[PDB]
Amino acid sequence: MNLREKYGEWGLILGATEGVGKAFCEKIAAGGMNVVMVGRREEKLNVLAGEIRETYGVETKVVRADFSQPGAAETVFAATEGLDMGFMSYVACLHSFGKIQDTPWEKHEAMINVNVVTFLKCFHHYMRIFAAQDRGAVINVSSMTGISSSPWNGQYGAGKAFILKMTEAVACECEGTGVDVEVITLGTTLTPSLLSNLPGGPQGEAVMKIALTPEECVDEAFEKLGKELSVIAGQRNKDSVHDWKANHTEDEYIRYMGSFYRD
Amino acid sequence: MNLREKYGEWGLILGATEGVGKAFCEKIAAGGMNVVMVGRREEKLNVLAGEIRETYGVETKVVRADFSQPGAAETVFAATEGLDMGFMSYVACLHSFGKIQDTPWEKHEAMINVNVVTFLKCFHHYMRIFAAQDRGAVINVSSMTGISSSPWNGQYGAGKAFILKMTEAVACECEGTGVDVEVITLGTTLTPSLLSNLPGGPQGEAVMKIALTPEECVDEAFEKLGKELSVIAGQRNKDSVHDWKANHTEDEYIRYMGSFYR
Ligand SMILES: NC(=O)c1ccc[n+]([C@@H]2O[C@H](COP(=O)([O-])OP(=O)(O)OC[C@H]3O[C@@H](n4cnc5c(N)ncnc54)[C@H](OP(=O)(O)O)[C@@H]3O)[C@@H](O)[C@H]2O)c1
Numbered sequence: 025m026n027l028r029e030k031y032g033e034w035g036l037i038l039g040a041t042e043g044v045g046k047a048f049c050e051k052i053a054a055g056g057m058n059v060v061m062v063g064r065r066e067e068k069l070n071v072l073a074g075e076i077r078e079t080y081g082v083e084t085k086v087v088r089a090d091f092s093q094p095g096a097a098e099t100v101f102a103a104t105e106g107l108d109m110g111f112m113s114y115v116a117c118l119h120s121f122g123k124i125q126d127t128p129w130e131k132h133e134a135m136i137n138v139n140v141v142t143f144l145k146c147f148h149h150y151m152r153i154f155a156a157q158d159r160g161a162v163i164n165v166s167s168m169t170g171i172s173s174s175p176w177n178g179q180y181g182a183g184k185a186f187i188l189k190m191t192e193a194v195a196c197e198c199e200g201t202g203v204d205v206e207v208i209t210l211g212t213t214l215t216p217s218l219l220s221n222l223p224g225g226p227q228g229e230a231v232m233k234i235a236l237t238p239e240e241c242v243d244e245a246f247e248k249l250g251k252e253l254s255v256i257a258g259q260r261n262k263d264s265v266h267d268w269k270a271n272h273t274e275d276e277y278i279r280y281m282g283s284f285y286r287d
Numbered sequence: 288m289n290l291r292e293k294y295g296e297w298g299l300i301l302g303a304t305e306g307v308g309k310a311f312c313e314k315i316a317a318g319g320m321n322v323v324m325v326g327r328r329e330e331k332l333n334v335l336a337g338e339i340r341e342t343y344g345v346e347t348k349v350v351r352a353d354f355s356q357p358g359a360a361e362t363v364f365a366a367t368e369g370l371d372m373g374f375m376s377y378v379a380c381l382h383s384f385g386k387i388q389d390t391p392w393e394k395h396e397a398m399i400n401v402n403v404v405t406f407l408k409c410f411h412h413y414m415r416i417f418a419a420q421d422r423g424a425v426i427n428v429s430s431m432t433g434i435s436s437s438p439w440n441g442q443y444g445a446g447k448a449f450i451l452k453m454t455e456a457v458a459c460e461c462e463g464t465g466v467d468v469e470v471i472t473l474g475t476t477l478t479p480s481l482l483s484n485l486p487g488g489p490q491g492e493a494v495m496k497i498a499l500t501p502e503e504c505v506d507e508a509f510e511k512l513g514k515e516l517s518v519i520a521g522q523r524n525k526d527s528v529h530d531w532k533a534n535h536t537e538d539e540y541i542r543y544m545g546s547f548y549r
């Protein structure tokens with residue numbers, strides 16, 4: 025759970041405001057890092073930043089940026105220049121319900137920006153930094169849809185797959201070096217986004233009981249940092265992926281993922 | 288009065304490791320029953336068994352068996368010798384996408400074993416036990432495809448319909464006895480991968496009003512045990528099946544199921 029001496033003074037949470045991003049901010053601060061917190065809700069980030077400073081006694085820097093827009097990465101670069109950087113996590117995602125043809129191009133472009141372009145610009149920039157000082161850590165967040173595909177939300181699984189395989193490559197590249205990289209692939213996790221799908225009564229409560237908390241996802245990711253390259257958070261999600269991979273065709277998995285919308 | 292007290296010491300979950308089987312294990316344990324958990328993934332069953340014992344304070348027993356293989360049922364029979372049995376649930380299902388001619392006989396034989404032969408061997412054996420002691424319960428699991436049929440995966444519906452109509456018959460036989468039998472027919476069930484493809488919504492909410500968690504399926508089954516013989520889990524699934532049954536022909540339903548493939 026220690027980060028500051030091993031990796032660096034400051035860690036950067038790209039999509040920090042709530043949910044998994046907030047859990048990352050608390051976790052790195054508990055590990056001795058000062059926190060650069062990036063997100064769209066500047067006021068909410070300021071409130072979080074104050075809680076982090078109070079609870080953990082580290083410094084904070086709030087950066088307002090929207091990863092769906094061109095130049096979001098470059099704004100973050102400017103805001104961190106001069107800091108001793110030790111950690112990055114790409115947490116934000118964007119998805120949008122619809123068949124490929126039913127989603128407008130401007131929405132497709134936004135998803136390319138959040139899940140691919142902003143992602144990679146950040147990953148490249150901070151890897152240049154970490155690799156050059158031979159110390160640093162990256163934990164990027166992927167999704168089980170990056171493994172399964174996401175019918176009726178296609179670009180979501182696509183962009184999370186890009187994150188997954190780019191981070192797996194880099195993780196293997198960093199073994200034996202002072203930089204430690206990992207991708208952690210989430211399933212259902214108790215963030216506001218998730219909670220938005222849940223009807224009030226037992227129809228929602230049943231899901232609460234099988235979802236993971238953001239804290240446990242983050243704790244597992246740090247436990248395995250530097251030892252495992254590609255981790256699926258929670259035993260149940262790991263086992264599920266293995267079962268699909270070992271015992272089913274690719275098409276069986278894909279058709280199963282379409283269950284809500286077809287038969 | 289709890290399940291243990293009403294039916295017996297041990298329940299047997301045939302296909303226990305995840306999904307609806309896992310939910311049956313947890314549910315009977317919540318009712319005070321000890322759990323015999325049967326499935327292929329032995330180390331995963333051990334983990335689950337540990338969690339159940341810790342959470343609910345009942346005893347557990349893990350049995351490794353593969354219901355696609357001849358001799359699987361006999362392995363389970365041997366494993367429960369001497370236990371006071373009060374419950375059984377057949378949950379395991381095997382299906383394999385393909386037109387009939389494109390699926391090899393060896394896979395067809397495996398499906399017969401899981402959905403029909405191992406199913407009936409176990410149902411017969413434990414009904415002979417339950418009926419002799421005049422005490423026990425059985426909840427078997429079927430699928431919507433047992434109602435609709437499943438073009439391009441014919442044995443799924445076929446096997447699920449065998450389970451459905453067998454269990455319905457026996458459920459009628461067992462009214463007026465100390466054995467309580469029910470079949471529950473399931474639609475879309477929220478398993479770990481499927482859950483992670485929620486749209487956010489409220490398209491997400493809309494999906495969740497129809498799709499059930501395993502826990503919800505099992506809660507409804509126990510709520511209706513000894514009261515209803517054949518249940519369709521979930522209110523919206525009930526509405527859908529009624530609409531199909533009342534306002535469409537059989538061929539319209541089949542052709543809807545086949546309209547995804549070509
Ligand atoms: N929750 C789940 O069940 C689930 C399931 C599978 C995978 N995941 C993965 O977990 C991660 C978190 O996703 P989540 O949906 O649960 O949200 P989350 O943890 O709340 O995301 C953290 C924060 O990132 C920020 N963010 C989102 N879009 C952004 C943008 N364009 N620019 C800057 N910041 C942005 C949001 O705050 P602002 O609104 O203030 O910007 C959000 O609170 C994703 O990588 C996702 O693929 C989650």
Ligand SMILES: NC(=O)c1ccc[n+]([C@@H]2O[C@H](COP(=O)([O-])OP(=O)(O)OC[C@H]3O[C@@H](n4cnc5c(N)ncnc54)[C@H](OP(=O)(O)O)[C@@H]3O)[C@@H](O)[C@H]2O)c1
Nearest residue numbers: 264267302304305306307308326327328353354355379478
């Ligand atoms: N829940 C998941 O993570 C998961 C993963 C892959 C696929 N699926 C899909 O979801 C459905 C299966 O759901 P499910 O696994 O969640 O639970 P389920 O249908 O409630 O089945 C309960 C359990 O029965 C066991 N079983 C299946 N075949 C068996 C056999 N031949 N002998 C003995 N036990 C057997 C399986 O565990 P063992 O494998 O340990 O035998 C399975 O977990 C299928 O349509 C499958 O395509 C789900």
